């Protein structure tokens, strides 16, 4: 509402452009937040609706020099496919290669001395004064090669220039130019001197070059490209075709008609034969079959489906012919939801991120003016105290001035220094490694969203779990139904339609399992009238009732805990009191029941914990995270449930009206929360919360408030998402520790330091050791497709020897 846009920009390639994109936008008035993403090419803005408009976003990105238009809805892999630019950087090393071979058998017959040479190395007889046969054929093809490879990285620069944004290619063009240039002047001057030897020059570079460069630019798009495996096969999934079937009476087909998924819309009935997959969600008609979501929520079963149960669209189907009713279509379809989830997790960038930004886009000037003072000194040591320098060039030729060699050296040291500088290790050092790990959570069923989240993920201290939806199933079961008034004028059957009309009322989920359970157990379909029904959340449910013949031929209704009794003037006794007592301890809550002030008896609800709930936690402790629980029920079920769990500390008789306080107590500390709720439910003490992580969410994965979202309503889930976080965090780190050895240690070793040991690099070396860098850091982030999820016995195994009982002695609560 707030006039968040999206963009999606065309021609952004260094990892430059973000920060001065970022920073352009973030100092003009009314716009606060900006954030662009190099891996998907799509801005994220925020501006005030009346201030601006998105016209005048897309005409200053315009300025800036970049296309930009509006994010589109189906069109989505063309984007991260990368195939343009890996068909235009197989051509262009292609087409480089057959300009790099005659150098490189030029220069290596030079090196090998021949046993019986024909003529002992005649291949450089001059033929004029100055200039050699080997250096008109290196002078003829470089200039070839510039003058048909550099193309590229020529208009590209000019592009940069235009602005004030220096750039990657800025590096290039420097060193092309400068080699180029140098050699030109230093063979002018040899020619029109007459000099006898002809000078070495750097012709041969440039040639040797471009083939690097271009190889080592196809090789990183090359390993670019598996980083976006996960999201591509996500989206080619969804089906396209529809065979919508028309139900004339008794699901009669009259006929059979063909219709794209942008054209059919929600009431349409539509048909899946086997093998086919489900076009749309919806509710199952009539027909027992099974299905496979393995590439949908990342399960390995068939489970197995029934007429009146859902579908989710993606799956295939694999007996029999079935009718749905189609509900959700278009965007709406989980498997969008959860597209969508993933695209927009890569745009909540990390601080961290922002540093990486704010160090790269002043990293260009740093080595211009580091080539330069190289430069600069080298002229001045040459020029100024040259027993250095000749102590380490001892050899003094007739053929040579002794200036040529010291001016040829600075400038090859100034050339080489930045030759070497490979901005682009530092920039795609985190996006990569955050894109991999969150495909492959994706691929997992955890759904972690935003790159916040992932550093986030590190430095949780205590976590906290809410008991319904996340321990238990969520289905509660009664027990028994106990009686303790009269029998005769409150017979068992009246007791039972009674309480079955008053719950109806409501949609407590233990309301309808009750409700369920009087209407099968009694006989009866049918239920009472019910009126002035007061719900008071965490209080209790009153109401009267009336039309109670209609049960019974074959009123005050007072529900809830035992505050609830007491507020409406009603005693408890202390028989009763010690009636809920034994249920209590073996973690089933209990409903008492009063009609017209009487005593009527007791209601037995349990629900059943999880298996997982033992592994899950004691693997969190295990890890070194604290938890705790939270919930609104009674103080004795509260203990129970804790001891058959693990958790020491629980946050019982919590209301539904505050309900973030706790989350504020345990952040007053300074350390960092995460509550693991269940969704739509908890949804102010998840965003309120650092982490909040909705477990149990099947098709509803559309959730805002809360920012980890586990699709399988499985418990291990959530260790898994810390674990696959933390390898993910520790890739940043490792990525930007070889950005930096590499720069620094680049630098000074082509920087000439290091002619004392005696090791100097040509130009063509420096690049042939920058390709290498690139890749590798992509192939770094990739080794992170190789996890395996964990599975029952692999958690178990580490877990074998320490399994500490605990009991309710040990069991703290809150205070107040
Ligand atoms: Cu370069």
């Given at each position: 509402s707030d006039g968040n846009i999206e963009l999606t920009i065309t021609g952004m390639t260094c990892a430059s452009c973000v920060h001065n994109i970022e920073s352009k936008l973030t100092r003009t008035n009314g716009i606060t937040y900006a954030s662009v993403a190099l891996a998907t090419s799509k801005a994220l803005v925020k501006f005030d609706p009346e201030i601006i408009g998105p016209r005048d976003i897309i005409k200053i990105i315009e300025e800036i020099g970049f296309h930009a238009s509006l994010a589109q809805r189906n069109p989505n892999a063309h984007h991260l496919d990368h195939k343009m630019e890996i068909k235009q950087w197989k051509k262009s090393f292609l087409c480089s290669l057959v300009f790099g071979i005659p150098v490189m058998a030029l220069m290596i017959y030079m090196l090998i001395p021949s046993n019986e040479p024909h003529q002992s190395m005649v291949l450089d007889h001059n033929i004029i004064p100055g200039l050699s046969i080997l250096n008109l054929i290196f002078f003829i093809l470089c200039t070839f090669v510039q003058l048909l490879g550099g193309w590229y990285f020529y208009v590209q620069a000019y592009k940069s220039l235009r602005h004030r944004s220096a750039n990657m290619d800025v590096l290039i063009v420097l060193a092309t130019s400068i080699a180029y240039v140098y050699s030109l002047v230093i063979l002018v001057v040899a020619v029109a001197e007459k000099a006898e030897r002809s000078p070495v020059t750097f012709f041969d570079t440039p040639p040797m070059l471009f083939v690097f460069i271009a190889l080592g630019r196809w090789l990183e798009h090359l390993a670019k490209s598996k980083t976006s495996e996960a999201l591509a096969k996500l989206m080619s999934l969804q089906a396209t075709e529809a065979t919508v079937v028309t139900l004339?009476?008794?699901?009669?087909?009259?006929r059979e008609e063909q219709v794209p998924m942008e054209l059919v819309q929600r009431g349409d009935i539509v048909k899946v034969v086997p093998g086919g997959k489900f076009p749309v969600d919806g509710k199952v008609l009539e027909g027992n079959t099974m299905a496979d979501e393995s590439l949908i929520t990342g399960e390995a079963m068939p489970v197995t489906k029934k007429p009146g149960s859902t579908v989710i669209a993606g799956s295939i189907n694999a007996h029999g012919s079935v009718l749905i009713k189609a509900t959700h279509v278009g965007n709406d379809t989980t498997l969008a939801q959860i597209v969508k989830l993933v695209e927009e997790?890569?745009?909540?960038?990390a601080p961290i991120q922002q540093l990486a930004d704010r160090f790269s886009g002043y990293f260009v000037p740093f080595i211009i003016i580091m080539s330069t003072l190289t430069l600069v000194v080298w002229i001045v040591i040459g020029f100024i105290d040259f027993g250095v320098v000749q102590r380490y060039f001892p050899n003094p030729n007739k053929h040579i001035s002794q200036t040529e060699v010291i001016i040829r050296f600075a400038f090859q040291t100034s050339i080489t220094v930045l030759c070497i500088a490979s901005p682009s290790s530092l920039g795609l050092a985190t996006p990569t490694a955050v894109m991999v790990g969150t495909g492959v959570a994706a691929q997992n069923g955890i759904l972690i969203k935003g790159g916040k989240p992932l550093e986030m993920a590190h430095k949780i201290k205590t976590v906290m779990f809410a008991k319904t939806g996340t321990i238990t199933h969520g289905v509660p079961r009664v027990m028994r139904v106990l009686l303790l008034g009269d029998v005769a004028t409150l017979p068992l059957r009246k007791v039972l339609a009674v309480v079955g009309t008053a719950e109806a009322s409501s949609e407590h989920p233990l309301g309808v399992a009750v409700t369920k359970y009087c209407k099968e157990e009694l006989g009866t379909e049918t239920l009472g009238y019910c009126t002035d029904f007061q719900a008071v959340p965490g209080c209790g449910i009153g109401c009267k009732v009336s039309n109670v013949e209609g049960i019974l031929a074959h009123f005050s209704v007072l529900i809830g805990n035992r505050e609830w009794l007491r507020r409406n003037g009603l005693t408890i006794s202390s028989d009763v009191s010690d009636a809920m007592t034994d249920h209590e301890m073996k973690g089933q809550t209990a409903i008492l029941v009063a009609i017209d002030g009487v005593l009527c008896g007791m209601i037995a609800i349990a629900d059943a914990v999880k298996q997982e709930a033992a592994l899950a936690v004691h693997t969190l402790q295990s890890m070194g995270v604290d938890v705790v629980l939270i919930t609104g029920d009674n103080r004795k079920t509260a203990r129970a449930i804790a001891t058959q769990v693990g958790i020491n500390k629980v946050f019982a008789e919590v209301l539904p009206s505050h309900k973030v306080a706790k989350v504020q107590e345990l952040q007053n500390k300074g350390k960092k929360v995460a509550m693991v709720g269940d969704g739509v439910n908890d949804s102010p003490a998840l965003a309120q919360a650092d982490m909040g992580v909705a477990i149990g969410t099947g098709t509803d994965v559309a959730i805002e408030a809360a920012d980890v979202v586990l699709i399988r309503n499985d418990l291990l889930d959530v260790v898994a998402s810390i674990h696959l976080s933390k390898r993910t965090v520790r890739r940043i780190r490792i990525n930007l520790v070889l950005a930096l050895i590499y720069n620094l240690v680049g630098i000074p070793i082509a920087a000439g330091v290091f002619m004392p040991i005696g090791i100097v690099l040509q130009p063509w070396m420096g690049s042939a050791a920058m390709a290498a860098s690139s890749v590798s850091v992509v192939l770094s982030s990739l080794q992170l497709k190789c996890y395996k999820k964990p599975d029952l016995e692999r958690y178990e195994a580490q877990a074998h020897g320490h399994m500490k009982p605990l009991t309710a002695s040990q069991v703290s609560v809150h205070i107040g």
């Amino acid at each position: 509402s707030d006039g968040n846009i999206e963009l999606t920009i065309t021609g952004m390639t260094c990892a430059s452009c973000v920060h001065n994109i970022e920073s352009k936008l973030t100092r003009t008035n009314g716009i606060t937040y900006a954030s662009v993403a190099l891996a998907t090419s799509k801005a994220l803005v925020k501006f005030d609706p009346e201030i601006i408009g998105p016209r005048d976003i897309i005409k200053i990105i315009e300025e800036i020099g970049f296309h930009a238009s509006l994010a589109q809805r189906n069109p989505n892999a063309h984007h991260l496919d990368h195939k343009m630019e890996i068909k235009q950087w197989k051509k262009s090393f292609l087409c480089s290669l057959v300009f790099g071979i005659p150098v490189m058998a030029l220069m290596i017959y030079m090196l090998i001395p021949s046993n019986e040479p024909h003529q002992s190395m005649v291949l450089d007889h001059n033929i004029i004064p100055g200039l050699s046969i080997l250096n008109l054929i290196f002078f003829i093809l470089c200039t070839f090669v510039q003058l048909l490879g550099g193309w590229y990285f020529y208009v590209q620069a000019y592009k940069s220039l235009r602005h004030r944004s220096a750039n990657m290619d800025v590096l290039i063009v420097l060193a092309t130019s400068i080699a180029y240039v140098y050699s030109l002047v230093i063979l002018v001057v040899a020619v029109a001197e007459k000099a006898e030897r002809s000078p070495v020059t750097f012709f041969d570079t440039p040639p040797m070059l471009f083939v690097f460069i271009a190889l080592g630019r196809w090789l990183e798009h090359l390993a670019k490209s598996k980083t976006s495996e996960a999201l591509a096969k996500l989206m080619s999934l969804q089906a396209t075709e529809a065979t919508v079937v028309t139900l004339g009476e008794d699901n009669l087909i009259i006929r059979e008609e063909q219709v794209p998924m942008e054209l059919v819309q929600r009431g349409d009935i539509v048909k899946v034969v086997p093998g086919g997959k489900f076009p749309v969600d919806g509710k199952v008609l009539e027909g027992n079959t099974m299905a496979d979501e393995s590439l949908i929520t990342g399960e390995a079963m068939p489970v197995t489906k029934k007429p009146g149960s859902t579908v989710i669209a993606g799956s295939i189907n694999a007996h029999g012919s079935v009718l749905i009713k189609a509900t959700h279509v278009g965007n709406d379809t989980t498997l969008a939801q959860i597209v969508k989830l993933v695209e927009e997790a890569q745009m909540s960038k990390a601080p961290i991120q922002q540093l990486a930004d704010r160090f790269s886009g002043y990293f260009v000037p740093f080595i211009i003016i580091m080539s330069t003072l190289t430069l600069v000194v080298w002229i001045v040591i040459g020029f100024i105290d040259f027993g250095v320098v000749q102590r380490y060039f001892p050899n003094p030729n007739k053929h040579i001035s002794q200036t040529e060699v010291i001016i040829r050296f600075a400038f090859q040291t100034s050339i080489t220094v930045l030759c070497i500088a490979s901005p682009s290790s530092l920039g795609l050092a985190t996006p990569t490694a955050v894109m991999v790990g969150t495909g492959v959570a994706a691929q997992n069923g955890i759904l972690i969203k935003g790159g916040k989240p992932l550093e986030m993920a590190h430095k949780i201290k205590t976590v906290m779990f809410a008991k319904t939806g996340t321990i238990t199933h969520g289905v509660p079961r009664v027990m028994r139904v106990l009686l303790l008034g009269d029998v005769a004028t409150l017979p068992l059957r009246k007791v039972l339609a009674v309480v079955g009309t008053a719950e109806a009322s409501s949609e407590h989920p233990l309301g309808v399992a009750v409700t369920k359970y009087c209407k099968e157990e009694l006989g009866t379909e049918t239920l009472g009238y019910c009126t002035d029904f007061q719900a008071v959340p965490g209080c209790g449910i009153g109401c009267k009732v009336s039309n109670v013949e209609g049960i019974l031929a074959h009123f005050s209704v007072l529900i809830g805990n035992r505050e609830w009794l007491r507020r409406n003037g009603l005693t408890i006794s202390s028989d009763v009191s010690d009636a809920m007592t034994d249920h209590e301890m073996k973690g089933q809550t209990a409903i008492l029941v009063a009609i017209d002030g009487v005593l009527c008896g007791m209601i037995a609800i349990a629900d059943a914990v999880k298996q997982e709930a033992a592994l899950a936690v004691h693997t969190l402790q295990s890890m070194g995270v604290d938890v705790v629980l939270i919930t609104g029920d009674n103080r004795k079920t509260a203990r129970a449930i804790a001891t058959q769990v693990g958790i020491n500390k629980v946050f019982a008789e919590v209301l539904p009206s505050h309900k973030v306080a706790k989350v504020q107590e345990l952040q007053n500390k300074g350390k960092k929360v995460a509550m693991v709720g269940d969704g739509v439910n908890d949804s102010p003490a998840l965003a309120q919360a650092d982490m909040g992580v909705a477990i149990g969410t099947g098709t509803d994965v559309a959730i805002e408030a809360a920012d980890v979202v586990l699709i399988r309503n499985d418990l291990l889930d959530v260790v898994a998402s810390i674990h696959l976080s933390k390898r993910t965090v520790r890739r940043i780190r490792i990525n930007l520790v070889l950005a930096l050895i590499y720069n620094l240690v680049g630098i000074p070793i082509a920087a000439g330091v290091f002619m004392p040991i005696g090791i100097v690099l040509q130009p063509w070396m420096g690049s042939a050791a920058m390709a290498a860098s690139s890749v590798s850091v992509v192939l770094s982030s990739l080794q992170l497709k190789c996890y395996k999820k964990p599975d029952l016995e692999r958690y178990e195994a580490q877990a074998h020897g320490h399994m500490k009982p605990l009991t309710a002695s040990q069991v703290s609560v809150h205070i107040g």
